[PDB]
Design a protein around this motif. Sequence first.
Motif, PDB file in Angstrom:
ATOM      1  N   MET A  21       0.903  -1.413   0.057  1.00 50.42           N
ATOM      2  CA  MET A  21       0.051   0.064   0.030  1.00 50.42           C
ATOM      3  C   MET A  21       0.762   1.364   0.035  1.00 50.42           C
ATOM      4  O   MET A  21       0.513   2.178  -0.689  1.00 50.42           O
ATOM      5  CB  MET A  21      -1.010  -0.049   1.061  1.00 50.42           C
ATOM      6  CG  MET A  21      -2.005   1.088   1.162  1.00 50.42           C
ATOM      7  SD  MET A  21      -2.969   1.239   2.495  1.00 50.42           S
ATOM      8  CE  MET A  21      -4.084  -0.307   2.433  1.00 50.42           C
ATOM      9  N   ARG A  24       1.960   1.986  -3.554  1.00 51.75           N
ATOM     10  CA  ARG A  24       0.846   2.310  -4.297  1.00 51.75           C
ATOM     11  C   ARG A  24       0.315   3.747  -3.868  1.00 51.75           C
ATOM     12  O   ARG A  24      -0.017   4.682  -5.118  1.00 51.75           O
ATOM     13  CB  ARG A  24      -0.517   1.729  -4.229  1.00 51.75           C
ATOM     14  CG  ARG A  24      -0.616   0.113  -4.585  1.00 51.75           C
ATOM     15  CD  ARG A  24      -1.803  -0.685  -4.730  1.00 51.75           C
ATOM     16  NE  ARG A  24      -2.094  -0.755  -3.136  1.00 51.75           N
ATOM     17  CZ  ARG A  24      -1.868  -2.089  -2.470  1.00 51.75           C
ATOM     18  NH1 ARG A  24      -1.016  -2.938  -3.003  1.00 51.75           N
ATOM     19  NH2 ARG A  24      -2.614  -1.958  -1.320  1.00 51.75           N
ATOM     20  N   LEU A  25       0.381   4.275  -2.671  1.00 57.85           N
ATOM     21  CA  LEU A  25      -0.180   5.530  -2.330  1.00 57.85           C
ATOM     22  C   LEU A  25       0.664   6.540  -1.980  1.00 57.85           C
ATOM     23  O   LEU A  25       0.362   7.599  -1.920  1.00 57.85           O
ATOM     24  CB  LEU A  25      -1.156   5.235  -1.004  1.00 57.85           C
ATOM     25  CG  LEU A  25      -2.352   4.317  -1.319  1.00 57.85           C
ATOM     26  CD1 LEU A  25      -3.319   4.160  -0.064  1.00 57.85           C
ATOM     27  CD2 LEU A  25      -3.265   4.702  -2.767  1.00 57.85           C
TER      28      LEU A  25
HETATM   29 LI   LIG Z   1      -3.846   1.363  -2.381  1.00 59.86          LI
END
Ligand SMILES: [Li+]
Length: 35
Positions: A21, A24-25
Amino acid sequence: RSCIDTIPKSRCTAFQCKHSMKYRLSFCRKTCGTC
Ligand SMILES: [Li+]
Ligand code: NA
């Protein structure tokens, strides 16, 4: 928001986009298609 990666490009892998995550973020918003 601007759409860039904030770590070196070659760190932004398909595998890390799938499984982190953070990638991704935060780290690889462009390469992971978050933007
Ligand atoms: Li994400
Ligand atoms: Na960049």
